[PDB]
Design a protein around this ligand. Structure first.
Ligand SMILES: N=C1N[C@H]2[C@H](CS[C@H]2CCCCC(=O)O)N1
Ligand SMILES: N=C1N[C@H]2[C@H](CS[C@H]2CCCCC(=O)O)N1
Ligand SMILES: N=C1N[C@H]2[C@H](CS[C@H]2CCCCC(=O)O)N1
Ligand SMILES: N=C1N[C@H]2[C@H](CS[C@H]2CCCCC(=O)O)N1
Lengths: 123, 123, 123, 123
């Protein structure tokens, strides 16, 4: 975990993020887009639960990216929840929620759900 | 948003969190439990997309809480994704994902999904 | 469960559905819209797991509605997953997934997630 | 869609289901387990929205399986929501919700979320 989490990660779509896993569960870094209504780099911040593991379990973690930077303001934010598995083929398996700001009437359709798997090699 | 986000929030279950919405989209604070395998206060970190809004839309945001502090280590983390609506009865409507670290075999059952609504009054 | 499930149900939004819980776990009925890109009545089909319960537990169930009838063809379908709780104030608490048919490129944004609570009184 | 949906489907985990897509949006069949607290065959029922598509879009559909048969009664049900894509390598990409009957206190942790991709070849 932590040291093994620090570094560059890539998903299938092409998205990339660089993260630093701090000693006390913090995750800080940048996400750079590859395919959605995101463009460029965005700040990412999250947390991980280190014990984490005498039974080769994953390390739970999560992070958020608000889709606003100096070139785009998408009025939305995504949170990824999942776990880190280390080793030869270490990976972070996640499920995500993307919420867009809507009026009260359209609030029911404000959140999309999906999944992403990140690896240290692309892809 | 931001100023209106800063403060104390409560949900139905009894959970409470205090957050500070920083000038550049940051959200930092503490979450104090009321009903799950959480006990005490945990650090919370997230982001919000301010434009946010000439059509009374919500401000999208998200945050993460790793369930580890000096009294408990639950080996899990939760991410809340949703939007802030201000006014007389301001609220944050969210959907959450809670992932627990599991072995590869039990990974398919590692994530729970739910929702939470927070208000400035309890409840 | 079953007998207690059979009948008319209403949610907050105004949606209504009438269902018959058959002896062998089947759920058949119609859903009539109140607020989304649905209009009129649609066929609903699902299943419930009766044991269901010496510890006042809910009865798990789920159903699907394809948003196509003689007046509208929304190219989408919603599934509701949740449980039935009976009694004075019986209810069905659910979480739903709504998928729209998209091209491969937009598949990542094809599914919305939300929740609905149904009661026997409106609302 | 429909004809192309009828047949046998397999996912990564090993699960298999045979379905018949009826003329008027119905989906009926059986799901046979491979890895969860399911054992044997279970009845599956769902619906699909045929228009479905002058822009090679998927056909939205969904189905439910209550995990009860003559050998097991898991007190739970799963709903899969997704779309069918046909062709050389036709597939059904889905996201699922699995709800277990719980007492009111544990209702917040009653639903798991995940995804499954089914193909006509295993896997
Ligand atoms: N790696 C991923 N990219 C898309 C999904 C969830 S977040 C999303 C990109 C969204 C960009 C902003 C937007 O489209 O509003 N996963
Ligand atoms: N306010 C909420 N509390 C429960 C749900 C999602 S997070 C959860 C508390 C989890 C505590 C840690 C655990 O049980 O592992 N919403
Ligand atoms: N009772 C509910 N109505 C909306 C949500 C999920 S299903 C949805 C109505 C969708 C209608 C069809 C469409 O908009 O495409 N819950
Ligand atoms: N193909 C899949 N199998 C597991 C996930 C969601 S449904 C699940 C099997 C559950 C069996 C019943 C149970 O464990 O309670 N996808």
């Amino acid at each position: 975990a932590e040291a093994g989490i620090t570094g560059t990660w890539y998903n299938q779509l092409g998205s990339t993020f660089i993260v630093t896993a701090g000693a006390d569960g913090a995750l800080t870094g940048t996400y750079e887009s590859a395919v959605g209504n995101a463009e460029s780099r965005y700040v990412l911040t999250g947390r991980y639960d280190s014990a984490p593991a005498t039974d080769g379990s994953g390390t739970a973690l999560g992070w958020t990216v608000a889709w606003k930077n100096n070139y785009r303001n998408a009025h939305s934010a995504t949170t990824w929840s999942g776990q880190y598995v280390g080793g030869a083929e270490a990976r972070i398996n996640t499920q995500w929620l993307l919420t867009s700001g809507t009026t009260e009437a359209n609030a029911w359709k404000s959140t999309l759900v999906g999944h992403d798997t990140f690896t240290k090699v692309k892809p």
